[PDB]
Every structure is written in C-alpha cells, then in structure tokens.
C-alpha cells in the first residue's frame, strides 16, 4: 500500500496501531514498552511525545506476524509462502524529485543529529543507536545498486558508525571504492522511515540479477517511486521520512559499543567506519521508524520467524522430503532449527542435516538440527522434545560435526568464527537402524480432530 | 467432598460444564486433550452421546488445581516440604451406597467408560482407585463384557502381590476385590512410594458384598471377585508414552455388584502423548524431589523433570556453578544418587539465572553457552528402561549430557559473554504508568 | 544431427568409427575388445559380422568424451558446460506412423529373441544381456 504514512492508517483502523501520548525517553524507556508489548502481543507503537523531544518514534511496526503479512498484500500469513514461491522460481523504478522525502534540507554545520530521538536501547550500551536506516551504496566499477539495515552508533555532532559487516555486498562496495579511486571519499546514502514493501525488501536475500527495489517495490501494487539524493548521484527511495546523505573518510573509524545482542549479552567493544553525514533532508511532520533487539524475542526475532516462512518454498523445492522447517526466537532466530521430514529412507535425516547446514547461506551457522517425523510439530516444544526422548538414543543418533564455520561473534565456539555442529536424528528408526522392533505411535483421527474444530467456539471454554 | 471440591473449582473459574452430547468414545479424550495443552479448566461432560452418567475428566490438568486440591495454592512451598519430612475413620451410612445392583442386573455397559485412542481395544476405566492393612493403586481396566474387568496390575506390585499371598495361603479360593471411582481429592491424591495431605483421617464404609473399605467420598463403587486361572488378553492401549502397547494377558475381575451414589458422576481420565493429565500430577508430586537431591548437592537450584520427556526421561537442572567441570558431577549425580532418575536419558544443566521451567530460558542457554562438541557427555552402555525401544538394546543404550553452564576460564579461552540485564529503574517507572496506556 | 545412422556416419568420416568384418561373438568376444579400446581409447565399434548372426552389434559409442561432444552438437568438450547452465535456468514432440521405427512387425508366437545379438558380457554372468534398452512406461 502506497508510502509509509498510507500503510501507517490501515493499521490504526483495525486496532493495529497504537497512539501514545504520554512523555517517553528515547533513553531505554521506549524499548523496556515495546518490549512488554512484544512479549505479550500488543500492537505497532507511535510516540508523538518523546521525552524533551518532538519527532514521533514509531517502533514494533512488524512486532507481530499479522503486522507482517499485511504489509506485504494479504490478511493470510500463508501467502508469505507466495513471497518464497516468487525467489526460488526467479532461478521496474520510477524517479521523481520534489517528491516528499527532500521537502526539508540541513547541510554542512547546521547538521546536528541531536535534533532527531534515536533510541538508547538496554542499560550499558555506548551512545545512542540508529538501528532502523535502509543504507544504499554503489559499487563504482557497474551501476547496480544495494541496501542493507546496520546499527548506527552516533559518536559526534554529525558522525555516524557504519557497523556493516565484511561479506555484505554493502561492505564490499566500499572496499573496491577505495580499491579504484585510492584516498577518494565514499559516498553513502541512508533512508529512513520508509514504506512496507521496500522495507520487507531490505531484510531479505535477493540473486544479484536482479535490484531490491525492483523485487521489494513489486511486493506493493506499485513501482518504486525512487529519487537522486541532493550530494550524491545515488537512489534513496522517495517515500521516505528522513533521508541522511554524507561519505566515509578514508582511513576513519570510531571504537564501537558495547551493546546488546539479540543474543542477549554485550557485544564487546571494536572499531568501524565513519559515516559523515553533510546532509540531513526531511518532510515537516517527518517520521523516524526505529527498532531494538535483546534476549529474544524482539522485532527482528519476530521479523525472523517473519522471513522463515518465507524460506519454507525454496526449502521445500530444494528438499520435497521437507514439510516444515522453523528457527525458534529462543535460540537467537538462527541458531537452532527445527525440520520434519517424510522419511522416505535408512539414513534419510542426515542428508537433510547437512542440506539445512550449507543450501542456504543464512543457515550455515546454525549450530543445532533436530530432524523429525511429519508426525511431530515442529512449532511445538511438547512434540519436539517428546520426538527426542521417545524415538532416539543419543549417541547413536547424533551427529557431531568439527571444525565448521561459526560466528565470529559466538563467544561459546573454541576459537573466534570456528566451532562444532551438533544434528540430532529425532526420525523414527527403520530396520538397518535398529535392531529392534519400534513401537506403533498413537495417531488421531483427522476426522475426530476436523469435527471437535466446527464444535471449539460453540463449547466455549 | 469430590462435589464440594467441585462447587469450590466451578466457582473459581477452574471447571467448565458441558451441555452438549458428546462421545465417550474418542471425542472426550481430544476435547480433553486440546484443553489440557492450554491451561484449561477441568470438564463436566454433563450428557455424553448415548449416555446419562455425566463425565468429569481432566480434574488435574492444572499445576492451580492440584494444589486447590490440597487446600493451598503453591505447590512448590507444600509439596517440597513434604518430603523434607520424607489412622482412618469409619462409617455406618454413606451417599456412594444408596442404589445397589447385584447379579445380572449389573452391566458395566451403560457407564460412559471411554475410549480415548483410535487404536484403542476396548473402552478403558482410568481413575478407578482398585482395593485389596488394605492396598490402594490406580491400575488401568479394561472393559470386556457386561461385568468383566482386566486388572492390570504389573506382578511386583502390592495389589498384585496381595494375590499372590491369596494363592499362596488359600488356593481355589476366589480373591475379593473392590474398585471405588471418584473420591475426595485428597483420597485420590494416592501416589508417590498413604497421603495425608488434608490432614484430618480418610473416611470409609464397609463394602456390601465384602470385607473391605473404601472411600466415602466415592461416586460409584465396583464389588465383586477374581476367579484363580481366569485370564483376557488386554491391549492394545495407548500410554503415556506416545505409543500403542503390545496385547498381553492379564486376571479378570467379575462386577458382582455396583454400588453408586444418585446423580452419580464418572471420574475418568486419559494417558497419551505427554503432556496427559497424570503427567502434569506427576510433575507436582515430583516437587517432592528437590530437597531430597539438594540436600545431597546444595548447588542445585531447581530440579525439573519436564513431562514432554514422558515424565522421567529428561531433567534440567539449575545449578549455582561453583568450580571449572561442575556441570559434570551434578550430571552423574543426577544419574546415580536416587534410583529414579537411573534412567534418565538426557539431563540439561544450566546456571541459576535461567528458569528451568521455561523452555525459552533453557533454549537461550543451551545455543548461547554451548559448543555443542565440546560440551556433551556422552556415555554408554548404561542401564536404560527395558521397555524403551529407543535403546540399540533392550535394557542398555546411552545416556546425554548437556553442559548449557558458563564456561569459566580452562573450560574456554575466549572472553565470555555478560548477560544483559533490565535495568531495576526502568523496571519501576514502568512498574507504574502500564495500566494507564492502554495498548491491548 | 537427425537420426541415429546420419549421426554414424559423421564418425566413420574423422576417424571415429570402426569397422570390424571379422566374426565376432556377442557372448563375451565383442566386450573384451571393447574394454581393450576403450582403456587405451580407440573408436566407436560396428560390427557387421557376429558370430552365427548377421544383425551388426553397435558398441562404445560414446566410449571417450569427444564422441559425446559431437553427438551434442560441438567439437569443444568445454560447451557440455553449456548443457549444464540449460538445466539450472529452467528452476516440443513431433508425431509419424510408417515412420522408419516399425516397417517390419513380428508379433505373438513369432517373437523369439534369440533372433537379436544380445551380448555376453563377462565370465559367470547369467544369460545374455540386453544392455542398451530406453524404457518407456506412462503413469496411469
């Protein structure tokens, strides 16, 4: 649905949106809130009060499911399953100027990022985080271009961290711009507050033939309407709140953090670019759209079970056996992995193993499977854990891996981006196996369980 | 009283009437069952499909409810005081005797005993608290014939041996035996190696037909007899476990006569897929535990036996870690100090500042404090339950160790993690204006 | 290039097909030789004279990577690469009758096999093999 602001409505409509008119502080207070509302379920929050400040503070906007799929076209989260029918199958822009996102400019000193509420997230983080910009960058040697979400440490009057990280094509486009023109500024542009369907576009892997405007704008109804920034002759989109224009000083960078992971601990602290912004160009009542994450859940832990539906398709193409597949918030939104499978096969659950460890690059960290029966759910931790205890001996049915790539961030692994794998075979176990004779599984009725559905509400309970 | 408790609960919120007519047959079990994975009020199948015998199951569905049944509200304060540690009372007249039925007028067809399994054998009697000093135990019976019982005592146990020292001492002689359904909570609270719970004395009344005493509180009563020699194939039955049982042979128990209060109400239950109604009764019992083991290691925080590991299979464990390797002995203490637990095969063990009952806490810590070889212990050839057909072979396979602790430094090299922690601040000054922003 | 016989003879033409006249037995014979010109990497072998037999026996046909080139459409082993980024983008027929296939039925009792020069491949094999058959079936 069209910009930002237009998305913004529907919500506030049906009860998915919720106004605050209270003074709240960019300082941890509009996390610990958004938090309670998250763990709980509440709705998107929008603060036209922050706490000495006067720019309104949306954060939680995809703090739910729902939130999710209706910003992408439907009602159903079971048309997030299309979303992943769309990338796998897949194996345009629209310019304007005047457009809103540039209404208001702020250049050279009169850049003061004070002026905007970023949020202070948890207790000892450093200072305040910029944790919701849509970075684009240009590679110097083609033409095409590309977006990613980094947090952004505000250390000085106009200076910002650019925490990207070394394989992200973002990273890389810097690296060959000091690579061809040595000693030569780069210029970067981050959008902010920006509408759903290019925003759902930036948290998502996309082939490089094609440009995450043309597959994130065509998740709206409508082609992106796109601009040229006012000092650099690189695209933001144009249904933007606040655009931020500046380069990187070749050679600079600032000591970054700590701060909280939605691991759940304290990142320590080490040094990243700086990100000099000469221009901060906005709207009038002009938006910031902002996050946070910590100790799972959090948005983007939502945001990740979110995406996994959407990975569900290209899975399953790549994997038919597969009939579900889920990273649960608890561990990190990437660190375990449930999958079930229909065995078809002695042996079956070990070729799914390494499948989830290395077909996708998203899923090479992660240090647990657990492979299951189509019998068990695989959402619930009642069937999963009953599936391990009931159908495996353990050392028999473990598999351990050694030596394997890791994050480089990952404390608990021996040495730094180098730790051990652990997938556990939860399949019941056909002959060639075991030795024995396996027990007969209670199964239900699909009859009995499609008749007590039509009786639920009228039993009320 | 079984109908005072009831009252009590239905007021509460904790206990839900229903009207509709609906199957003792497959129908009440995933009723039951989708209730009982929600934290549902206990049911009152008021008119059963083909039936006029109201049914109660999922009593005990609710850690809230055992403990209300006990006449407390904690269970963890009272329970596991219990075992820090670790007389009846007659009558000439009772409600449970008021209509009686001998001879062929007994048939045990018009009570809605259920089937709660597809696969299932026959309907099966649950809760019936069988009698036999005098013995209780909760053994599972299966329906074959108009007034004939499977009873399914396993041979070590006290009711079985009890008919045993009948064979021994008067052979050809019938064993007299008595099975009461639905008594006072407490009176049901029959479990772990009886239960004084309420505190005042268990009332009983004599038996009608024979010499034995049971519960005051019954709402329908089973007499009758067990001919030596007289066997039934029972099975096969869904468990607790997730699985159907193998048919195997078992004595018969002839009805000779039903005793039963008017407006009598059927207590039965199900065993399945864990969690089921007596594995959440066994998680509360379980509390018993805890000081037991932390007398032995005070290091431990919690002790907890989740019953979606079929209630024994799995342990987390919390810990105050207290040197380099501590994760370790706690394991094979687990394992070894009480005989319960020699068959657990998996057992978690994570520091103090996780909940131990809260997958979430324990998921966290496992895939943010483990590599997951260098931190499991695997052991084998241990004694593991012959029944679990998991095991490479019957009665030995391997057991698992999870060290989801911290690792001090000799266990790691890397600088490790400090958890985040909320601010006890931003704590209170939320701790006030919540009510007051209404976000739903 | 079209059908089977119009691809044969572009072979015999650079040296890639040979012609054997000499009596060979489909039991074993004709299955060492092409074992001993495959390991040391002769050409493709026709053999118009089996022995007691005079249907000619075809083998080795692709018995080194250059006759598979070929039988693509190219000269470079390097465009089988091409074959390849074909069946990963993707992520027509043509009917006859006295079409040259049947021009000659033998049905019922008729049918003896014995009348075809299957080989014999090795040592203690069972019977005969017919080695080269492409399967057709339909999914009811």
């Known amino acids: 649905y069209n910009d930002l602001r237009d998305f913004l409505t529907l919500l506030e409509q049906q009860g998915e949106l919720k106004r605050i008119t209270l003074p709240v502080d960019p300082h941890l207070e509009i996390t610990e809130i958004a938090d309670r509302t998250l763990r709980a379920g509440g709705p998107a929050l929008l603060f036209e009060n922050p706490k000495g400040y006067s720019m309104p503070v949306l954060c939680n906007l995809f703090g739910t499911p729902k939130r999710v799929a209706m910003g992408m076209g439907q009602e159903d989260v079971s048309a997030l399953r299309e979303v992943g029918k769309l990338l796998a199958f897949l194996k345009p822009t629209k310019r304007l100027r005047g457009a809103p996102c540039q209404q208001k400019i702020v250049s050279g000193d009169d850049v003061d990022l004070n002026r905007i509420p970023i949020m202070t997230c948890w207790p000892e983080d450093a200072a305040p985080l910029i944790t919701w910009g849509l970075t684009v960058t240009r590679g110097p040697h083609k033409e095409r271009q590309n977006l990613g979400i980094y947090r952004q440490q505000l250390i000085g009057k106009n200076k910002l961290i650019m925490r990207w990280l070394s394989h992200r094509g973002g ?256 399949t019941n176990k056909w002959p060639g196996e075991t030795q024995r004779e396996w027990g007969r599984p209670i199964k239900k009725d699909p009859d009995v369980v499609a008749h007590i559905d039509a009786i639920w509400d009228e039993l009320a309970i």
């Open 171 to 426: 990273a890389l486009d810097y690296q060959e711009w000091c690579a061809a023109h040595p000693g030569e500024r780069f210029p970067v542009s981050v959008a902010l507050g920006a509408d759903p369907a290019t925003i759902l576009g930036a948290v998502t892997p996309v082939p490089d033939t094609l440009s995450e405007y043309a597959f994130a704008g065509l998740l709206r109804g409508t082609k992106t309407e796109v601009v040229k920034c006012i000092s650099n002759d690189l695209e933001v989109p144009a249904s933007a709140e606040i655009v931020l224009e500046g380069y990187i000083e070749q050679g600079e960078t600032a000591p970054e953090g700590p701060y909280g992971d939605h691991t759940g601990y304290y990142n320590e602290v080490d040094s990243f670019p700086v990100f000099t912004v000469t221009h901060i160009t906005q709207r009038e009542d002009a938006i910031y759209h902002s996050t946070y994450t910590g100790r799972p859940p959090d948005e983007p832990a939502v945001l990740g079970v979110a995406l996994n539906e959407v990975f569900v398709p290209i899975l399953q193409k790549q994997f038919p056996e597969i009939v579900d597949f889920y990273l649960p918030p608890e561990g990190c939104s990437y660190r375990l992995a449930v999958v079930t499978i229909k065995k078809q096969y002695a042996g079956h659950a070990k070729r799914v193993m390494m499948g989830v460890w290395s077909f996708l690059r998203q899923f090479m960290y992660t240090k647990f499977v657990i492979v299951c029966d189509d019998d068990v759910n695989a959402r619930d931790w009642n069937d999963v854990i009953w599936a391990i205890t009931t159908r495996m001996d353990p050392a028999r049915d473990t598999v351990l891996v050694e030596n394997t790539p890791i994050d480089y961030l990952d404390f608990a692994s021996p040495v730094s981006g180098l730790g051990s794998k652990m997938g556990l075979d939860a």
